[PDB]
Write a protein that binds this DNA or RNA. Structure first.
Lengths: 92, 63, 100, 111
RNA sequence: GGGUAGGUGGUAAGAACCUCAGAUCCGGAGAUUUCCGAAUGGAGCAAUCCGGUAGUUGGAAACAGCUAUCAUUAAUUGAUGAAUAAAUAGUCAAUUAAAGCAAUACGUGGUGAAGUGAAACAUCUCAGUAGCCACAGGAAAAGAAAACGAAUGUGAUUCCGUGUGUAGUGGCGAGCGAAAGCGGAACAGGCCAAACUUAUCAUUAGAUAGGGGUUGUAGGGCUUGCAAUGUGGACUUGAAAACGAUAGAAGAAGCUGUUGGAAAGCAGCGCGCAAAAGGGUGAUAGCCCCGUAUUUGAAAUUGUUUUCAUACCUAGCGAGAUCCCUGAGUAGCUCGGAAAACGUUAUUUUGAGUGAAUCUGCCCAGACCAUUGGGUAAGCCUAAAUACUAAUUAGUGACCGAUA
RNA sequence: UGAGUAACGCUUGGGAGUGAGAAUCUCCCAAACCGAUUGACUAAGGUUUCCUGGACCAGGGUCGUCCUUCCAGGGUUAGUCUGGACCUAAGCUGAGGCUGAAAAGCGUAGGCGAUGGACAACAGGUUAAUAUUCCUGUACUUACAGUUAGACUGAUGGAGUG
RNA sequence: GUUAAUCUAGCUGUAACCAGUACCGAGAACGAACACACGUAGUCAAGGAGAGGAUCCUAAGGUUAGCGAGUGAACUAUAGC
């Protein structure tokens, strides 16, 4: 109960396609050390709705800015997708 | 190890020669023998003991 | 300044203020993920205020004094989901018992 | 203490702009410049339009803008007397009204 | 605490803010310090997974958050406890220390090369060097004579110069190289066992804890006297003081013309220095700026030294007496080595055996005996004087200037 | 200098379009190809090269509007699949222990180490980038309570299948 | 334990964690300093003739081998005669 596992909700075209259906999908970026149950509890105690399905995925660090005289690396990121029972939508 | 349990004193390393006076790095091992020692607690225990320390114990009534 | 934090009741009011500031900062960061924030400077100010309150609490004891007594449309959607699941299970069992 | 306080009048000792007066606005003591209004009006060329044709208020032409002046070239101005001499500065005076005060070496006039 | 007007670390232009109700900045003192990592709750492919135990909140629960703990060894203490009755090993519980890293540099110790030189090479040198390993420490090691050694002698040890390329040692070959003494650096000696005695140990204790002494001009213990009340530091704490160290302050003196893009250079007349070190400023500036010599300044932390008080340790001169004690596998001896300048010789040290005396003693003075003289081993401890600089501060350089 | 020479490392044509410029870019139609393979599906390894938009300085053995090149923005979704929390073969580590100048070497109790064992989900559709995972339909397992019916349950250990 | 525990069966509610999941993958992205004719685990495996996954042409599906255009000397390689 610290709510230190919700960094930023992303807004991409895939997301925009996702909420237009009947499920109102939500996606957050999460501290890489937080599990499914931690995210579920945080989401329950941040809006008041108990999620049905909670799924997670990862992005490996990737080389970015190939030509810069210094090759940087993309940061490790973990995303959590949360879905709600059909027929409800909540603002962020 | 090849050392008596009464005092840390192991082998000695030196040079071995012949009539040709050639050098050879050779070790000399202190003699050990498992003779039981009776500690003044009603107990006996076998430990590796040098023969010289064994003579000292024999003359000191320590078995 | 920070001297005004020593004066107040450092038992229960400060921790409630910490929780409220944490919630507001989380909402601020969520707005930062969006376009409608318009006040860049508030993030660092709130972060430093939280750091100061955490220091002044830590000088005495812990932050989490949980030993005390620390939406609404979800019920409708949950009722609909339970009804749908119940109907699916009932029809499945009815067909299963009608098979023989 | 610093020789120049933001707000007071200043003059220039050496350079092309002899006998010039001005008011100080910005000071960068880390790398030792000084910004005075009305002096060193360099002709900036607002090179913005040719980057791309999207922005507005991007092609105005030759515009006069201020240029930094090295701090050591300046001298504070004296006007507490009919015949004033642009002199040195002394920090030692310590009235109880404030921490320290400043005074011209060649005369006795506050600030 | 210092110190004030800008500040939001560099690639930095900027949108949005803080700011003289004393910001940024400097110094001191404080907290969070995720994970790995000696990693130590258990594992592992380092930055991963899985837990047990005790509280606390949600609940009906699985479980989930929020907190704390859970390695080993060694030592100490207690309970438990086998074969075997007791007892021992083992087991459990509790407390206390390490466990590693590095300063490419010093020290001690263990182990320990070859190339090469000898124009080959085995003796030998390299070399007790390199490597590996153990442990440090702020330096380390050594240390108070069983010494030297030829003297009407010096008097712990350590380092430097000399003695000296000497005496000598070497298939007498390459080579190797002291010890006295002298002149310097610094300088100070203390503490245990022993007889004697007290108290306690199934008083058989042989063990535990107290006084007593620290030894060669032989000393100490014993019986018995006189006179101290103090010299003092390898030294416990309290009170103060000085001088530093970690932030800062005050802190002098110029114009005019000139070539000139710009003057500070150049020319004329001036000014100050306990400050003419240095750096910057549109050309080489003492007087444009920061500064610099000097005088000052410490809320807090910290170092050295000084004074007083205080705890422990310490002191001189007699008399008796064949009274007692004075460092045991000890030293020599033999068999092989090794440090010694010596390639094994007294000296020293030891792997195997052998194995005394008690002041009428023992050892030493390069085989040994006798005489003479010197010193008291086989117990322990020690400051400075010596080597080194990865770190911090300031400064220096007939050291370098982008193939350096 | 060798020198604008040797080589440029398994193949074409036409039309339209793009374009500043096209044998090479795009589209269209043909042909010539391997087809137990140059195809469809994945192990180990590469870590973004996958998709979209832009560009052609450098890289493309010619050119280039185009590229596995660069820049900018996105993309992998699991109670059931791959491997953990289940199990063991070599083998590794290893309390106590033995052994060796030291470093260390051996080894017991244990613990790790699958290429194997047990273990419950299938068909279809959707996106440029994912789909036994997202979605529609239909299923199963293992804990967990409350409740209900019946039943004395039967291990760390023994024995057979395994 | 039998004042009940322990499982078994159905109903009601509840839980199911962590890491991989793109693309390439007998090759232009992997190992050969390369957009090299080299090398590499397993799985699918069409029709005619054929014992056959050989041989020939094809199906599904997929490539245009990252220099070319000419002439058709000697000579070289490949083949045919």
């Amino acid at each position: 109960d610290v709510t230190n596992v919700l960094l930023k909700p992303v807004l991409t075209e895939k997301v925009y396609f996702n909420q237009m259906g009947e499920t109102k999908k939500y996606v957050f970026v999460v501290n890489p050390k937080a599990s499914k149950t931690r995210v579920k509890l945080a989401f329950e105690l941040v809006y008041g709705i108990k999620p049905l399905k909670v799924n997670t995925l990862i992005r490996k660090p990737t080389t970015i800015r190939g030509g810069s005289r210094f090759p940087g690396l993309s940061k490790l990121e973990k995303l959590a997708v949360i879905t709600l029972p059909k027929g409800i939508a909540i603002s962020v | 190890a090849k050392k008596d349990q009464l005092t840390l004193r192991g082998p000695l390393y030196g040079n071995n020669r012949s009539h040709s006076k050639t050098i050879t790095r050779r070790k000399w091992n202190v003699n050990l023998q498992p003779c039981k020692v009776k500690t003044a607690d009603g107990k006996t225990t076998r430990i590796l003991v040098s023969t010289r320390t064994l003579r000292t114990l024999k003359k000191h009534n320590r078995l | 300044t920070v001297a005004k934090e020593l004066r107040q009741k450092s038992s229960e009011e400060l921790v409630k203020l910490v929780i409220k500031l944490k919630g507001e900062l989380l909402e601020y960061r969520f707005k930062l993920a969006h376009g409608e924030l318009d006040k860049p400077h508030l993030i660092n100010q709130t972060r430093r205020l939280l750091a100061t309150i955490l220091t002044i609490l830590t000088e005495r004891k812990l932050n989490w004094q949980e030993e005390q007594a620390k939406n609404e449309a979800a019920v409708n959607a949950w009722k609909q989901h339970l009804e749908a699941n119940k109907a699916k299970l009932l029809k499945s069992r009815a067909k299963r018992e009608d098979a023989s | 203490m610093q020789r120049i306080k933001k707000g007071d009048k200043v003059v220039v000792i050496t350079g092309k702009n002899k006998g010039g007066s001005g008011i100080v606005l910005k000071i960068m003591p880390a790398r030792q410049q000084a910004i005075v209004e009305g002096l060193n009006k360099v002709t900036r060329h607002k090179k913005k339009d040719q980057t791309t044709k999207r922005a507005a208020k991007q092609s105005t032409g030759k515009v006069q803008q201020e240029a930094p002046i090295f701090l050591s070239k300046l001298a504070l101005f004296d006007q507490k007397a009919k015949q004033q001499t642009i002199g040195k500065i002394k920090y030692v005076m310590d009235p109880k009204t404030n921490k320290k005060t400043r005074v011209f070496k060649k005369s006795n006039n506050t600030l």
